[PDB]
Amino acid sequence: WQPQTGDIIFQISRSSQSKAIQLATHSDYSHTGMLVMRNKKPYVFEAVGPVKYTPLKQWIAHGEKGKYVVRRVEGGLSVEQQQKLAQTAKRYLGKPYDFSFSWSDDRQYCSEVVWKVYQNALGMRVGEQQKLKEFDLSNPLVQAKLKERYGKNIPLEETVVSPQAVFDAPQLTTVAKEWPLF
């Protein structure tokens, strides 16, 4: 794998919400970011409170067991497309972490910011949106974490984009994988 600006990278978060996210979204992925080459060095643009750039080596090390998978638009992006993603990403830097998973731009969560950058830079929708209530909220671990964060005021009608949703976007192919399934 030769990292390129725009590559979308996924990992298992070590945060306490990570398991609930995996369960609700039927996914192994609980954190995502987008590669940005800065002076030819790979950084991961990610919404972690705040939205920021992180050196790729450090980003990967933070994932559980160092596991990661990388998706890229099939056939690659042009240099011009890459420069538009990089440019747009700049507009979200410094935004705090979106603890509400709200679709407003005030704060950002991980898959929200990757989705919004692709949409605003290239007009690509990289992933299906659905309502919070449409996820799988049946597991008691999931219900406990929703209670912890939201109490009774769960935003059931909120438009959300999950990491799994971005992963399964039709444009994408896998270009790197260090993820043993044993």
Short recap of the structure:
With 182 residues, the chain is of the alpha+beta class. It has six helices and eight strands. The chain has a single domain, classed as endopeptidase fold (from Nostoc punctiforme), CATH 3.90.1720.10.
Q: Which terms would index this structure?
A:
about 180 residues, alpha+beta, endopeptidase fold (from Nostoc punctiforme), structural genomics, unknown function, structural genomics, metalloprotein, PSI-2
CATH topology: endopeptidase fold (from Nostoc punctiforme)
Distance between the termini: 22 Å
What sort of overall outline do the alpha carbons produce when their principal axes are compared? Answer: globular
Classify the beta-strand content into a percent band. Answer: 15-25%
Query: How much helicity do the residues have?
Result: 25-40%
Our count of domains comes out at 1
Q: Main sheet, how many strands, which sense, barrel? A: 6 strands, antiparallel
Radius of gyration: 16 Å
Keywords: Hydrolase
Organism: Escherichia coli O157:H7
Pfam families: Peptidase_C92 (PF05708)
GO molecular function: hydrolase activity
